[PDB]
């Protein structure tokens, strides 16, 4: 069946980002889920699983098989990275700032408050554990919160940094030395990073005030001191890549910097925005610098030798009204209250374009199928045709007066486009080509609020405040000149593709189906499932007319069997008001897309 697969409009929220071990993919906490970006192919996806709250910390083990993520309350989900299934939950009972697997993947380490926890794979001797990792030791030493962790390449040692202005180094395999083996004093401000150098004979400590200390064995003594002298900015994050000797630093201003150690040579000095750099990652070759800022919330992948950006996105924050799939199913396009229209590439997850001609809320968008032509309707009140190959607005249809448009229907062929208004009881009709006004469809006696064509030429259903469905043919003879009486009110109407039936969603929790030849109700579904009086405001038939997908101002999205009038699957939108305003199958119904308050949601099957 269908599973959550993409979260569009959001690339980074909070927490740490991390490259895969080969340096080719980037993981990004995207709220309470984790996204993965394929940087060499421009694909991304989002994991199905959700945390109870926002993610605070993640790590992918070296062997590329185990993903662990931790929400703000210290509730951790461990995931089979390659099969995408959840393997386990941990409760660490405390806020964790950082988690990191040991290089050999046998261990992982936690920063929970002031403590360093070490977790291990169960010994076959103790022989009766049902968890992939048991806790092996808690290490108590710091006076305040551990800030970051760094493993020693041999996996036997770890560095912690803290707000207590020290770093410490722990022996974390040999049983049992529970106490830090060396403490590193003392910076003025919080120690942000502490790193072994590639040869393991130098340690670097970096601190919020802006200091780097070099430490060598002689006991460990400070050997040199360096300073960023960045003004009105503190170190907000830092990482180090030992083999290429690269230190990447992100500041509370938009600024980030690249150095090498131990020379402390300034290689790069740039900005990413005007907001804090919350997380930084250097990929395996050193060639690629990743940055996350929360406020906006940006994600950057930067190839610094060539001064070019591999990836550069921020979060989107529109209120979406309508969404429409392109016929190939490659893209979905969304309509926004501010009046913007956006084009999204399903496979990359990114926004290809942004039109802004509409000077008022875009109420609907719909594809002429084929080709790359998309129509939009607006309160402003115009209908606009859009070319998606050249990304422009060639035609613009209006009425002989300034009337808002609320709904939109594009004859699939598409000879003609039509739109309903609140400012009258007629359906307005334009020849696409001419592209002038045609004789309206006038018989409704309430404002028309829903429109829907079939695929099989060329039945037009409409729905009105008058609480009736009418059936039209723009040019030929209708298939039902008689009205249909719904008791009511109709929030959404989807015409079955064949054109022999129609479905509507009512103000009661009813999806009801009507035969058009008989103008009588053939099926009613009582929609009762809404993890929230209760209804649906958007429905859509699948291509073969066997399924309806539905959402409304609640937290459930429902997938109904239409013949058997049952529920196939319910999708709880969010696990922490939630609204879904537009819902639609992809052309081959291999997926469906939902415009929610939690962003653009894609559910898929494979």
Coordinates of C-alpha atoms in Angstrom, one line a residue:
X1 CA 0.0 0.0 0.0
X2 CA 0.8 3.7 0.1
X3 CA 3.5 5.1 2.5
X4 CA 4.8 8.6 3.3
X5 CA 7.7 9.2 1.1
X6 CA 8.4 12.9 0.6
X7 CA 7.9 16.1 2.6
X8 CA 8.2 19.0 0.2
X9 CA 8.7 22.6 1.1
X10 CA 11.1 21.8 4.0
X11 CA 14.8 21.0 3.7
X12 CA 16.1 21.7 7.3
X13 CA 14.5 22.5 10.6
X14 CA 16.8 21.9 13.5
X15 CA 19.5 19.5 14.8
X16 CA 22.6 18.3 13.1
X17 CA 23.0 17.4 9.4
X18 CA 25.4 14.6 8.4
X19 CA 26.9 13.3 5.1
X20 CA 26.8 9.6 4.3
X21 CA 30.2 7.9 4.6
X22 CA 30.9 8.1 0.9
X23 CA 30.3 11.8 1.0
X24 CA 27.6 11.6 -1.7
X25 CA 24.3 12.0 0.3
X26 CA 23.2 14.4 3.0
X27 CA 20.8 13.6 5.8
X28 CA 18.8 16.5 7.2
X29 CA 16.4 16.7 10.2
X30 CA 13.3 18.1 8.5
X31 CA 11.1 18.5 11.6
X32 CA 10.1 15.2 13.2
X33 CA 11.3 13.2 10.2
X34 CA 14.6 12.8 8.5
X35 CA 15.1 13.6 4.8
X36 CA 17.9 12.2 2.6
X37 CA 19.3 14.1 -0.3
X38 CA 21.2 12.3 -3.2
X39 CA 23.7 15.0 -4.1
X40 CA 25.1 13.5 -7.3
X41 CA 21.6 12.5 -8.8
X42 CA 19.3 15.3 -7.4
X43 CA 16.9 12.9 -5.8
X44 CA 15.6 13.2 -2.3
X45 CA 13.1 11.4 -0.1
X46 CA 11.8 11.5 3.5
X47 CA 11.5 8.6 5.9
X48 CA 8.1 7.3 6.8
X49 CA 8.6 7.3 10.5
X50 CA 7.8 10.3 12.8
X51 CA 9.0 11.4 16.2
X52 CA 6.6 12.5 19.0
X53 CA 8.4 15.8 18.8
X54 CA 11.0 17.7 16.7
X55 CA 14.4 16.0 16.1
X56 CA 17.3 17.2 18.3
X57 CA 20.0 14.9 17.1
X58 CA 20.8 12.1 14.5
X59 CA 23.6 9.8 13.3
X60 CA 24.2 7.4 10.5
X61 CA 26.7 4.6 11.4
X62 CA 29.8 4.3 9.1
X63 CA 28.8 1.0 7.4
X64 CA 25.7 2.9 6.2
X65 CA 23.2 0.5 7.8
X66 CA 21.9 2.1 11.0
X67 CA 20.2 5.5 11.4
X68 CA 19.4 6.7 14.9
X69 CA 17.5 9.9 15.6
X70 CA 16.4 11.5 18.8
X71 CA 13.7 14.0 19.6
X72 CA 13.9 16.9 22.1
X73 CA 12.8 14.7 25.0
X74 CA 15.4 12.0 24.4
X75 CA 13.1 9.5 22.7
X76 CA 15.2 7.7 20.1
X77 CA 14.2 5.7 17.0
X78 CA 16.7 3.3 15.5
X79 CA 16.2 2.6 11.8
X80 CA 17.3 0.0 9.3
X81 CA 18.7 2.6 6.9
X82 CA 18.7 0.5 3.7
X83 CA 15.3 -1.2 4.1
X84 CA 13.8 1.8 5.8
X85 CA 12.1 -0.1 8.6
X86 CA 12.1 0.8 12.3
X87 CA 14.1 -1.7 14.4
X88 CA 13.8 -0.2 17.9
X89 CA 12.9 2.6 20.3
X90 CA 15.0 3.8 23.2
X91 CA 14.1 6.1 26.0
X92 CA 17.1 8.0 27.1
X93 CA 15.0 9.8 29.7
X94 CA 16.9 13.0 29.2
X95 CA 17.5 15.7 26.6
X96 CA 20.3 14.7 24.3
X97 CA 22.4 17.2 22.3
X98 CA 24.3 14.8 20.2
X99 CA 24.7 11.1 19.3
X100 CA 27.5 9.4 17.3
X101 CA 28.3 5.9 16.4
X102 CA 31.8 4.7 17.0
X103 CA 33.9 4.2 13.8
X104 CA 33.5 0.4 14.0
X105 CA 29.7 0.6 14.6
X106 CA 29.9 -1.6 17.7
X107 CA 29.3 1.4 20.0
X108 CA 27.4 4.6 20.0
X109 CA 27.8 7.6 22.4
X110 CA 25.3 10.0 23.8
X111 CA 25.5 13.5 25.2
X112 CA 22.6 13.6 27.7
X113 CA 22.9 16.7 29.8
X114 CA 26.3 16.6 31.5
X115 CA 26.7 12.9 31.1
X116 CA 28.3 10.8 28.4
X117 CA 26.5 7.5 27.8
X118 CA 28.1 4.7 25.9
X119 CA 25.9 2.0 24.3
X120 CA 27.2 -1.4 23.1
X121 CA 26.2 -4.4 21.1
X122 CA 25.1 -7.2 23.5
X123 CA 27.6 -9.9 24.4
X124 CA 26.6 -13.4 23.3
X125 CA 27.6 -14.5 26.8
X126 CA 24.8 -12.6 28.6
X127 CA 22.6 -14.2 25.9
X128 CA 19.1 -12.8 26.6
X129 CA 18.7 -9.2 25.4
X130 CA 16.0 -8.1 23.0
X131 CA 17.6 -4.8 22.0
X132 CA 20.3 -4.0 19.4
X133 CA 22.2 -1.9 22.0
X134 CA 22.3 -2.0 25.7
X135 CA 23.7 0.8 27.8
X136 CA 27.2 0.0 28.9
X137 CA 28.3 2.9 31.0
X138 CA 27.4 6.4 32.2
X139 CA 30.3 8.7 32.5
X140 CA 30.0 11.5 35.1
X141 CA 32.5 14.4 35.2
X142 CA 31.3 17.6 33.5
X143 CA 29.6 20.3 35.6
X144 CA 27.3 21.4 32.8
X145 CA 25.9 20.2 29.5
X146 CA 28.0 18.1 27.1
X147 CA 28.0 20.0 23.8
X148 CA 29.6 17.7 21.3
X149 CA 31.4 14.3 20.9
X150 CA 34.2 13.1 18.8
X151 CA 35.4 9.5 18.5
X152 CA 39.0 8.3 18.3
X153 CA 39.5 6.5 15.0
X154 CA 40.3 3.2 16.9
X155 CA 37.0 3.6 18.7
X156 CA 38.6 3.3 22.2
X157 CA 38.4 7.0 23.2
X158 CA 36.1 9.9 23.0
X159 CA 36.3 13.6 23.5
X160 CA 33.4 15.6 25.0
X161 CA 33.0 19.4 25.2
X162 CA 30.9 21.2 27.7
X163 CA 29.4 24.5 28.8
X164 CA 31.6 24.0 31.9
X165 CA 34.4 25.5 29.8
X166 CA 36.4 22.2 29.6
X167 CA 36.7 19.3 27.2
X168 CA 37.4 15.8 28.5
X169 CA 38.7 12.6 27.0
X170 CA 37.3 9.3 28.1
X171 CA 38.5 5.7 27.8
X172 CA 35.3 4.0 26.7
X173 CA 36.2 0.3 26.2
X174 CA 38.4 -0.9 29.0
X175 CA 36.4 -2.1 32.1
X176 CA 36.3 -0.1 34.0
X177 CA 37.7 3.3 34.1
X178 CA 34.7 5.5 34.6
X179 CA 36.5 8.8 35.0
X180 CA 37.8 11.2 32.4
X181 CA 41.4 10.6 31.7
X182 CA 42.3 14.2 31.0
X183 CA 40.4 17.5 31.3
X184 CA 41.2 20.4 28.9
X185 CA 41.1 23.8 30.6
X186 CA 40.3 26.4 30.0
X187 CA 38.5 28.6 27.5
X188 CA 36.5 31.7 28.4
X189 CA 33.3 30.4 26.9
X190 CA 31.7 27.0 26.2
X191 CA 33.9 24.5 24.3
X192 CA 32.1 23.8 21.0
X193 CA 34.3 21.2 19.5
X194 CA 37.2 19.0 20.4
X195 CA 39.0 17.0 17.8
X196 CA 41.8 14.4 17.4
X197 CA 44.0 15.2 14.4
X198 CA 44.7 12.6 11.8
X199 CA 47.9 11.3 13.4
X200 CA 46.2 11.3 16.8
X201 CA 49.1 13.2 18.4
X202 CA 47.3 16.6 18.4
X203 CA 44.0 17.7 19.9
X204 CA 42.1 20.9 18.9
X205 CA 39.5 22.6 21.1
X206 CA 37.3 25.3 19.8
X207 CA 35.2 27.5 21.9
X208 CA 32.2 29.9 21.7
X209 CA 34.3 33.0 22.4
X210 CA 36.3 32.2 19.3
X211 CA 39.4 30.3 20.3
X212 CA 41.3 27.3 19.0
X213 CA 43.8 25.6 21.2
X214 CA 46.4 23.1 20.1
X215 CA 47.3 20.4 22.6
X216 CA 50.2 18.0 22.5
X217 CA 51.6 15.2 24.7
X218 CA 54.9 16.3 26.4
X219 CA 50.6 15.3 30.0
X220 CA 48.6 17.3 27.4
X221 CA 49.7 21.0 27.3
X222 CA 48.4 23.9 25.2
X223 CA 50.9 24.4 22.5
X224 CA 49.5 27.3 20.5
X225 CA 46.4 29.5 20.5
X226 CA 44.4 30.9 17.6
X227 CA 41.5 33.4 17.4
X228 CA 38.8 34.0 14.8
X229 CA 38.5 37.6 15.9
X230 CA 35.0 37.6 14.3
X231 CA 33.1 40.5 15.8
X232 CA 29.5 40.5 17.0
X233 CA 29.5 36.8 16.4
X234 CA 30.1 33.6 18.4
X235 CA 31.0 30.1 17.2
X236 CA 27.7 28.4 16.8
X237 CA 29.0 25.1 15.4
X238 CA 32.3 23.6 14.3
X239 CA 33.6 20.5 12.7
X240 CA 36.9 19.1 11.7
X241 CA 38.1 16.7 8.9
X242 CA 41.4 15.2 10.0
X243 CA 42.8 13.7 6.8
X244 CA 42.5 16.9 4.8
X245 CA 43.1 18.9 8.0
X246 CA 40.0 21.1 7.4
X247 CA 38.2 23.0 10.2
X248 CA 34.8 24.4 9.2
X249 CA 33.2 26.9 11.5
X250 CA 29.8 28.5 11.5
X251 CA 29.0 31.7 13.4
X252 CA 25.9 33.3 14.9
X253 CA 26.0 35.9 12.2
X254 CA 25.3 34.3 8.8
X255 CA 29.1 33.9 8.5
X256 CA 31.0 30.6 8.1
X257 CA 34.8 30.0 7.7
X258 CA 37.2 27.3 6.4
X259 CA 40.7 26.9 8.0
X260 CA 43.3 24.2 8.2
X261 CA 45.1 23.0 11.3
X262 CA 47.6 23.3 12.7
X263 CA 48.7 26.2 10.5
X264 CA 45.4 28.1 11.2
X265 CA 45.3 29.3 7.6
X266 CA 42.1 31.2 6.6
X267 CA 41.0 29.4 3.3
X268 CA 37.4 30.6 2.9
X269 CA 35.3 33.4 4.5
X270 CA 31.7 33.6 3.4
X271 CA 28.1 34.1 4.6
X272 CA 25.1 31.8 4.2
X273 CA 22.5 34.3 5.4
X274 CA 22.0 36.8 8.3
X275 CA 20.9 34.1 10.6
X276 CA 22.9 31.6 12.8
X277 CA 24.8 28.7 11.4
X278 CA 23.3 25.9 13.5
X279 CA 25.0 22.9 12.0
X280 CA 28.0 22.1 9.7
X281 CA 29.3 18.9 8.1
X282 CA 32.4 18.2 5.9
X283 CA 32.1 15.3 3.4
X284 CA 34.6 12.5 3.0
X285 CA 36.7 14.2 0.3
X286 CA 36.7 17.6 2.1
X287 CA 35.4 19.0 -1.1
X288 CA 31.9 19.7 0.2
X289 CA 30.7 21.9 3.1
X290 CA 27.2 21.4 4.4
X291 CA 25.4 24.0 6.5
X292 CA 22.0 24.3 8.2
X293 CA 20.4 27.5 9.5
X294 CA 17.1 27.2 11.4
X295 CA 15.4 30.6 11.1
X296 CA 14.6 30.4 7.4
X297 CA 15.5 27.4 7.4
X298 CA 18.4 27.0 5.0
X299 CA 20.3 24.1 3.8
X300 CA 23.6 24.6 1.9
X301 CA 26.0 22.3 0.2
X302 CA 29.0 24.2 -1.0
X303 CA 31.9 23.0 -3.2
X304 CA 34.5 25.4 -2.0
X305 CA 37.4 24.9 -4.5
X306 CA 35.0 25.7 -7.4
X307 CA 33.1 28.4 -5.5
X308 CA 29.8 26.7 -6.6
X309 CA 26.7 25.5 -4.7
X310 CA 25.7 21.8 -5.0
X311 CA 22.5 22.4 -3.0
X312 CA 20.9 25.7 -2.0
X313 CA 17.3 25.7 -0.6
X314 CA 15.3 27.3 2.2
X315 CA 12.0 26.4 3.7
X316 CA 8.7 27.4 2.0
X317 CA 5.8 28.8 4.1
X318 CA 2.7 29.3 1.9
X319 CA -0.9 28.5 2.6
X320 CA -1.9 26.0 -0.1
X321 CA -5.4 25.9 -1.5
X322 CA -5.2 23.6 -4.5
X323 CA -2.6 21.1 -5.8
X324 CA -2.5 19.5 -9.3
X325 CA -0.3 16.7 -10.7
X326 CA 1.2 17.0 -14.2
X327 CA 0.1 14.3 -16.6
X328 CA 3.5 12.5 -16.6
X329 CA 3.3 12.8 -12.9
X330 CA 6.7 14.3 -12.7
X331 CA 5.5 17.5 -11.2
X332 CA 3.0 18.8 -8.8
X333 CA 2.0 22.4 -8.7
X334 CA 0.4 24.3 -5.9
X335 CA -1.7 27.3 -5.4
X336 CA -1.1 29.8 -2.6
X337 CA -3.2 32.3 -0.7
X338 CA -0.8 35.1 -1.2
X339 CA -1.2 34.5 -4.9
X340 CA 1.9 32.6 -5.8
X341 CA 1.9 29.4 -7.8
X342 CA 4.8 27.0 -7.4
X343 CA 6.0 24.1 -9.4
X344 CA 7.6 21.1 -7.7
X345 CA 9.7 18.4 -9.0
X346 CA 8.5 15.2 -7.3
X347 CA 11.8 13.3 -7.8
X348 CA 14.2 16.0 -6.5
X349 CA 11.7 17.4 -4.1
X350 CA 12.6 21.0 -5.1
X351 CA 10.6 23.9 -6.5
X352 CA 11.4 24.5 -10.2
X353 CA 9.6 27.8 -10.4
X354 CA 7.4 30.5 -8.9
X355 CA 4.8 32.5 -10.8
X356 CA 3.5 35.8 -9.2
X357 CA 1.1 37.4 -11.7
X358 CA -2.0 36.7 -9.7
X359 CA -2.5 39.7 -7.4
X360 CA -4.8 37.7 -5.1
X361 CA -5.4 34.2 -3.7
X362 CA -5.1 31.4 -6.1
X363 CA -8.2 29.3 -5.5
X364 CA -7.5 26.4 -7.9
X365 CA -4.9 25.0 -10.4
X366 CA -5.5 22.3 -13.0
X367 CA -3.6 20.7 -15.8
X368 CA -4.8 20.4 -19.4
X369 CA -3.7 16.8 -20.1
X370 CA -1.7 16.9 -22.4
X371 CA 0.7 18.7 -22.6
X372 CA 2.8 21.0 -20.4
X373 CA -0.1 23.4 -19.8
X374 CA -1.6 24.3 -16.5
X375 CA -4.5 26.6 -15.7
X376 CA -5.1 28.6 -12.6
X377 CA -8.1 30.5 -11.2
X378 CA -8.0 33.3 -8.7
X379 CA -10.1 35.8 -6.7
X380 CA -8.4 38.7 -8.5
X381 CA -10.3 37.6 -10.7
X382 CA -8.6 36.0 -13.8
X383 CA -7.9 32.6 -15.2
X384 CA -4.4 32.2 -16.4
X385 CA -2.8 29.6 -18.7
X386 CA 0.8 28.6 -18.0
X387 CA 3.4 27.0 -20.2
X388 CA 5.6 24.8 -18.1
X389 CA 8.3 24.2 -20.7
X390 CA 9.0 27.9 -21.1
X391 CA 7.7 28.8 -17.6
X392 CA 5.4 31.7 -18.7
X393 CA 1.8 33.0 -18.7
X394 CA 0.7 33.2 -22.3
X395 CA -3.1 33.5 -22.2
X396 CA -5.3 35.3 -19.7
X397 CA -9.1 34.8 -19.5
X398 CA -11.5 37.1 -17.7
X399 CA -15.2 37.8 -17.5
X400 CA -16.9 41.0 -18.9
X401 CA -16.7 42.2 -15.3
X402 CA -14.3 41.8 -12.4
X403 CA -15.6 38.6 -10.8
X404 CA -13.7 36.3 -8.4
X405 CA -13.2 32.7 -9.5
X406 CA -13.4 29.9 -6.9
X407 CA -13.3 26.6 -8.8
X408 CA -11.7 25.5 -12.0
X409 CA -12.3 22.8 -14.5
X410 CA -10.1 22.1 -17.6
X411 CA -11.7 19.9 -20.3
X412 CA -9.1 17.2 -20.7
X413 CA -8.8 17.7 -24.4
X414 CA -8.7 20.7 -23.8
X415 CA -11.0 22.7 -26.0
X416 CA -12.3 24.8 -23.2
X417 CA -11.6 26.0 -19.6
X418 CA -14.4 27.0 -17.1
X419 CA -14.7 28.6 -13.7
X420 CA -17.4 29.2 -11.0
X421 CA -17.9 32.4 -9.1
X422 CA -19.6 33.5 -5.9
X423 CA -20.5 36.7 -7.7
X424 CA -23.1 34.9 -9.7
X425 CA -24.9 31.5 -10.2
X426 CA -23.5 30.7 -13.6
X427 CA -20.5 28.7 -14.8
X428 CA -18.2 30.8 -16.9
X429 CA -16.8 29.3 -20.1
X430 CA -13.9 30.4 -22.4
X431 CA -12.6 28.9 -25.7
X432 CA -9.0 28.1 -24.9
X433 CA -7.7 29.2 -28.3
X434 CA -9.8 32.3 -29.0
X435 CA -9.5 32.8 -26.1
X436 CA -12.7 34.7 -25.7
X437 CA -15.9 34.3 -23.7
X438 CA -18.5 31.7 -24.5
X439 CA -22.1 31.5 -23.5
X440 CA -22.2 30.8 -19.7
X441 CA -23.8 27.7 -18.2
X442 CA -26.5 29.5 -16.3
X443 CA -29.0 27.1 -14.7
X444 CA -27.8 26.8 -11.0
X445 CA -29.7 29.4 -8.8
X446 CA -26.9 29.2 -6.2
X447 CA -23.2 30.2 -6.6
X448 CA -21.3 27.3 -8.2
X449 CA -18.5 26.1 -5.9
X450 CA -17.2 22.8 -7.4
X451 CA -16.3 21.7 -10.9
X452 CA -15.1 18.5 -12.3
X453 CA -14.6 16.9 -15.8
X454 CA -14.4 13.3 -16.6
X455 CA -11.5 11.9 -18.7
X456 CA -13.9 10.2 -21.1
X457 CA -15.3 13.2 -23.0
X458 CA -16.8 15.3 -22.0
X459 CA -19.0 15.3 -19.0
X460 CA -18.9 18.4 -16.7
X461 CA -20.3 18.1 -13.2
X462 CA -20.9 21.2 -11.1
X463 CA -22.0 21.7 -7.5
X464 CA -23.6 24.7 -6.0
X465 CA -24.8 26.4 -2.8
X466 CA -28.3 25.4 -4.2
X467 CA -27.3 21.9 -2.9
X468 CA -27.6 20.3 -6.4
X469 CA -25.2 18.6 -8.8
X470 CA -25.8 19.6 -12.4
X471 CA -24.4 17.7 -15.4
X472 CA -23.4 19.5 -18.5
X473 CA -22.0 19.1 -22.0
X474 CA -20.5 22.3 -23.3
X475 CA -21.1 21.5 -27.0
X476 CA -23.0 18.2 -27.2
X477 CA -26.2 17.1 -25.4
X478 CA -25.8 16.6 -21.6
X479 CA -26.0 13.1 -20.1
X480 CA -28.5 14.3 -17.5
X481 CA -30.3 17.6 -18.1
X482 CA -32.0 17.0 -14.7
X483 CA -30.6 18.4 -11.5
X484 CA -29.4 16.2 -8.6
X485 CA -30.4 16.9 -5.1
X486 CA -27.9 16.3 -2.4
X487 CA -28.6 17.0 1.2
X488 CA -26.0 18.7 1.9
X489 CA -23.7 20.9 1.6
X490 CA -21.2 19.9 -1.0
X491 CA -17.7 20.6 -0.1
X492 CA -15.9 18.7 -2.7
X493 CA -16.9 17.0 -5.9
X494 CA -14.9 14.5 -8.0
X495 CA -16.1 13.3 -11.4
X496 CA -15.4 9.7 -12.0
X497 CA -13.1 9.4 -14.9
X498 CA -15.5 7.3 -17.1
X499 CA -18.1 9.9 -16.5
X500 CA -20.9 7.6 -15.5
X501 CA -20.8 8.5 -11.8
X502 CA -20.1 11.4 -9.5
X503 CA -18.9 11.6 -5.9
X504 CA -19.3 14.4 -3.5
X505 CA -18.3 15.1 0.0
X506 CA -20.9 16.6 2.3
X507 CA -21.0 18.7 5.4
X508 CA -22.1 15.6 7.2
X509 CA -19.3 13.0 7.2
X510 CA -20.6 11.5 4.0
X511 CA -19.0 10.8 0.7
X512 CA -22.0 10.0 -1.5
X513 CA -22.0 8.6 -5.0
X514 CA -24.6 9.3 -7.7
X515 CA -25.4 7.6 -11.0
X516 CA -25.7 10.2 -13.8
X517 CA -27.9 8.2 -16.2
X518 CA -30.3 7.5 -13.4
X519 CA -29.8 10.8 -11.5
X520 CA -30.1 8.8 -8.3
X521 CA -27.7 8.0 -5.5
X522 CA -26.0 4.7 -6.1
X523 CA -23.6 4.7 -3.0
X524 CA -23.1 6.7 0.2
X525 CA -20.0 6.3 2.4
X526 CA -20.2 7.4 6.0
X527 CA -17.0 8.7 6.7
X528 CA -15.9 7.9 10.1
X529 CA -12.5 8.2 10.9
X530 CA -11.2 11.5 11.5
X531 CA -8.7 12.0 14.0
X532 CA -9.9 15.5 14.4
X533 CA -18.1 18.6 13.2
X534 CA -16.2 16.1 11.2
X535 CA -15.9 16.0 7.4
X536 CA -13.8 16.2 4.3
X537 CA -13.2 19.2 2.1
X538 CA -11.3 17.5 -0.7
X539 CA -11.8 14.2 -2.5
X540 CA -10.3 12.6 -5.6
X541 CA -11.1 9.5 -7.7
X542 CA -8.3 7.3 -8.7
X543 CA -7.7 6.8 -12.5
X544 CA -9.8 3.6 -12.7
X545 CA -12.6 4.9 -10.5
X546 CA -12.1 2.3 -7.8
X547 CA -10.8 4.5 -5.0
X548 CA -11.3 7.9 -3.4
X549 CA -8.8 9.8 -1.4
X550 CA -10.1 12.5 1.1
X551 CA -8.9 15.1 3.5
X552 CA -10.3 18.0 5.5
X553 CA -9.7 20.2 8.5
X554 CA -8.6 17.3 10.6
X555 CA -5.6 15.0 11.0
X556 CA -6.7 12.0 9.0
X557 CA -6.4 11.3 5.3
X558 CA -8.6 8.5 4.2
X559 CA -8.5 6.1 1.3
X560 CA -11.8 4.5 0.5
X561 CA -12.8 1.5 -1.6
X562 CA -15.7 2.8 -3.6
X563 CA -17.4 -0.4 -4.8
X564 CA -17.3 -2.0 -1.4
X565 CA -17.7 1.4 0.4
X566 CA -15.0 0.6 2.9
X567 CA -11.9 2.2 4.3
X568 CA -8.7 0.9 2.8
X569 CA -6.1 3.0 4.8
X570 CA -6.1 5.9 7.1
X571 CA -3.1 8.2 7.2
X572 CA -2.6 10.2 10.3
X573 CA -1.1 13.5 9.0
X574 CA 0.9 14.6 12.0
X575 CA 2.2 13.2 15.3
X576 CA 3.3 16.6 16.9
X577 CA -4.4 23.0 14.1
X578 CA -3.8 20.3 11.4
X579 CA -5.6 20.9 8.1
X580 CA -5.5 19.3 4.6
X581 CA -6.9 21.5 1.9
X582 CA -6.1 19.6 -1.3
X583 CA -5.6 16.0 -2.0
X584 CA -5.0 14.2 -5.4
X585 CA -3.9 10.9 -6.9
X586 CA -0.9 10.9 -9.3
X587 CA -2.0 10.2 -13.0
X588 CA -1.3 6.5 -12.6
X589 CA -2.4 6.5 -9.0
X590 CA 1.0 5.1 -7.9
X591 CA 1.1 8.0 -5.3
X592 CA -1.0 10.8 -3.9
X593 CA -0.2 14.3 -2.8
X594 CA -1.7 16.3 0.1
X595 CA -1.5 20.0 0.7
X596 CA -1.4 20.3 4.5
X597 CA -0.5 22.8 7.2
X598 CA 2.5 20.4 7.8
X599 CA 3.6 21.1 4.2
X600 CA 3.4 19.3 0.9
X601 CA 3.0 15.6 1.7
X602 CA 3.6 12.8 -0.7
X603 CA 2.6 9.2 -0.1
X604 CA 3.8 6.5 -2.5
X605 CA 3.9 2.8 -3.2
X606 CA 6.8 0.4 -3.8

